Design goal:
This is part of a larger assembly, with chains A and B. By secondary structure, chain A is α/β, with parallel strands linked by helices. The radius of gyration of chain B is 33 Å and the shape is elongated. The N and C termini of chain B lie far apart (about 90 Å). The chains are: A alpha/beta, B alpha/beta. The PDB classes it as signaling protein.
Chain lengths: ~625, ~575
Amino acid sequence: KHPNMDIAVILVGTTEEVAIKDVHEKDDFHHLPVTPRVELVTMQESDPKSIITRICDLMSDKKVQGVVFGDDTDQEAIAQILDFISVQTLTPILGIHGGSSMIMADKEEASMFFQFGPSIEQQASVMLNIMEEYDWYIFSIVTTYFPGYQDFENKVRSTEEVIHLDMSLDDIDSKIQNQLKKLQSPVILLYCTKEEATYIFEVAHSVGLTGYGFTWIVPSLVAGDTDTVPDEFPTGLISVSYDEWDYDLPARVRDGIAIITTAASTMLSEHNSIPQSKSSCNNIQESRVYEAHMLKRYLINVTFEGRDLSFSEDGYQMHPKLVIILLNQERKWERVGKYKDRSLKMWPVFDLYLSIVTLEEAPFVIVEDVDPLSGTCMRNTVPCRKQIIKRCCKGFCIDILKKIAKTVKFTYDLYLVTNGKHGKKINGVWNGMIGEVVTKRAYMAVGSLTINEERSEVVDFSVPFIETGISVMVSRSDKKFQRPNDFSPAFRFGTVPNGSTERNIRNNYLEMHSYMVKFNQRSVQDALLSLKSGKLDAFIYDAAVLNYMAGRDEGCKLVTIGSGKVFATTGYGIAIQKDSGWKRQVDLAILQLFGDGEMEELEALWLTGICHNEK
Amino acid sequence: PTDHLTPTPISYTAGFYRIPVIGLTTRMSIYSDKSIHLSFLRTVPPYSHQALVWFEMMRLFNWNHVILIVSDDHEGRAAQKKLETLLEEKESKADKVLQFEPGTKNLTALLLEAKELEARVIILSASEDDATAVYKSAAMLDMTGAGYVWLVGEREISGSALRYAPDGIIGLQLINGKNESAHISDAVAVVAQAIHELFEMEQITDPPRGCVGNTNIWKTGPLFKRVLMSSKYPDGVTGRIEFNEDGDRKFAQYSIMNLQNRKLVQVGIFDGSYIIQNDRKIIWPGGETERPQGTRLKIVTIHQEPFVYVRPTTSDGTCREEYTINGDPIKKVICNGPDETIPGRPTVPQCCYGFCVDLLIKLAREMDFTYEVHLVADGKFGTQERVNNSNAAAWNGMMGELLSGQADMIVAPLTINNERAQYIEFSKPFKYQGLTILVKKEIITGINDPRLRNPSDKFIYATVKQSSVDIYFRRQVELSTMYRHMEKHNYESAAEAIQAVRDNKLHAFIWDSAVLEFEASQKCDLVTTGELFFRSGFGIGMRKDSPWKQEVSLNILKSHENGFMEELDKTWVRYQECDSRS
């Protein structure tokens, strides 16, 4: 009838001989169907032999069904050891502090082990949130062969250089110095054992990597307890860890006990069956312990005190509260941020402790020569440089960009493209602003740039701000376009080469391209020269430009085709690198612009032409 | 042996202090990752390293195309990684790869998938018990027969697996794998050389005395590992000794084994980087004096009137001698497809003859392949659909069969589009056509028709839901408004859609020209109007991974240049009675 479970807990360290004994286990939440029976033991310093012997010793006939481990130690290895015992015993074990909490190799699925440290993946996510908060976009990763690598590399990938160096085969070569010397990146993520970080850091100190503008960011393992900090670590080192202050170690142990007895209560509720099992390791594992698997299945998510203990398949808790910590000057570990569940919050505002390329379209981007007497740009004009001299850019892209920068609150450098303007493909290779987006010489490319499947494939695009596309402009699907030769007099139509229009044409309609190559024109003003003075009948180009030009002409001698309703309906987008980018944040900003109705005003000012006056 | 990798604990235990460990008998692969076991070295190569042989074997015989069957675990996946890495230097070759999970008695379906793959050579890694099931399942489908080759690990030939093993198989055995003692003498010899080389260095420290009281690693240990991995001493009882990066042994020697007369024999022996051929005669599975040999296409279609026709075979008798308008007998082939004639829908044996069929056989005379065709169960060619979570299911229809492998190649009138294009490789277009509208002549300005733009409940415009045209309507934003009007009053199939206009139930019908114009000729009561829009082409579907498509396009072009297509369209497009009516 009376279902009293058998449980054991151990504390190591605590900076005391006569470490605080049995502080907890005092009846709380007694309502839970099984009452805990607790035996507490402490041991001073960790060993594989001491721990294995003692845990088996407590097992005896005692038949304990659960174990919680806790340590004062910074040691990485401990968790794995206890985990090994778990694999052998099939007796659940978890740990609340220090090394046991420190990450470990992926746990054997059959095995049962849990850690109150955060998931490697979770930590990587937090590191990313931290970099995003300070908007440090460009970074590299230094890692070691220690377990979790490539679970980490993969997690970062999903969310400049990656380096894998074996601490084993320890170096005369300073091979780590020889590689580390190579990397030029400002923000570095490091991953390794607590001990390894020291060596890598001494070497970095030799290399000159710790100084002046470069900054390092670290996972839980290196900081460990945070009680002891060799100053071999550089100052300004940034890392995440669990907080001692929020909840003290006995509170955490209470959490562990609560998890074990809650899992026992739920398993009871399901099967009305005692979890209690023979604990002795030396002999074969007790029968019906093989049945224990479901316990793990039950134990993964557990809740008490309005607090979630939910685990992940690996055995780390799904979202323990976490603190952003920095090394304050001298030896201090002083908190900087708090982070929980989905969201993160950080305290310091600024100065703790994107370059853009465009092209001139005069409808969506106008280059002007600044007044020499003034020496610098005036009014709405924003500076842009072209390698060949400072040119002054202003216009639709400049204004849209300006509002976006104001809303998302970041600062940016603007320059002009040299090779190939808007991106162009000759054989195998890309050209233009897209090149500078691929070469990472540009983060985002802005302009009158059209959208297509290939570019959307290589780079993420912003949502279209304007209705545009291919269109026709003439004075005043039929296959009249398909062949000129069908009509006895020669007909004429042309477009600007190296355009998204020309590439699209070549993709879908070959004959039109092969015929129109003769009618291709140098520039839109010159293409206009071919239309305006005669010697050409029709002109084809981007719809927004053709509509603005429809509205603006020295005489209303030029008009659009039909209602100007364009095939290949598209809009002007904006380049980004890849799946990793500010991304969605941009998109929101954009439709907020129309959301307040600014775009209509900007349309009337910049886009609206005087022609189309008889309406 | 208890479970496996019974020398797991020591690598961990010594590993804490970085004390180097050397295994004699553990060929297990899971120790190769330095990350988990960082102190581990061995005088034997793992089972994964056996792939070195296979690549060399593959190298000699010139079969670039193979199939790999692995159990799912660190062992199998490691073997796959190693072999693929070997292939990476070459153009990466994943001809196919097949993963099964251990302890599974029946593997039949997976091999059924394997046969479809063209490559006829197979290599597998598994445990003895699993291998029994593998051979047991393989023999059922007669994959042990000639024209098929088997390459395998030492474990596979041994044990209960040997009993159920197929004839002519190729197999591997590591030399001195059973003996600890030779490896003992040699390992200790190496240790001695390593130590004597070690003490030449200074700043050495003795290993920790006793487990008790030492939480700290042993700084020398990694160095001891470094010298020991580099420790040469090529002369040894076991053979040449050098260690790879993982601490695994290099340049080990294996003895190739053959199953002749259901008994193990040494056909050759492998030592160093080069294989050696023993005087014994080569055996291949089934009867071969020498046979280094290394075949079917499942084709799927849909019922589309111009390019495909369906009639059942009369009784058992096969196909009619019916003749084309130009005097030629009509060719025909058998196809299994959906029948609506019975109240339930059976996959029914049928006779199908078509333009695409003549093309297919034209290829078949041109191409080494042989063909068996069955029509897809779903009347639709294909469209993405079903469940929300992750991405769930797959586009219903013949295309879905292609990814599924139900048919390895798709021959039908399929328009070619990017949304589909990412998923699969597309053959160069045999035909060039675009969408258009059919309306009866007898008393639509453009692709953009104000009459479409001015829709009416009174004036219908009809299409097939899940027809690719519908994908054009959904995917395209610019006309996205116009899609919905079309969505109303949709028809299920082509015949019904033409009929509605013929029945005059629906005033207009929208479909791609290649199917439509032939009908336009067929009746002339109905007419096509405007300019083909959504200009596109029809092509034969294949997976990107299959190289046969490379020939197909190459063949398609060759068929275009000679005017073969022109004459085929000329045959199958009658053109007999119709004109511009006005």
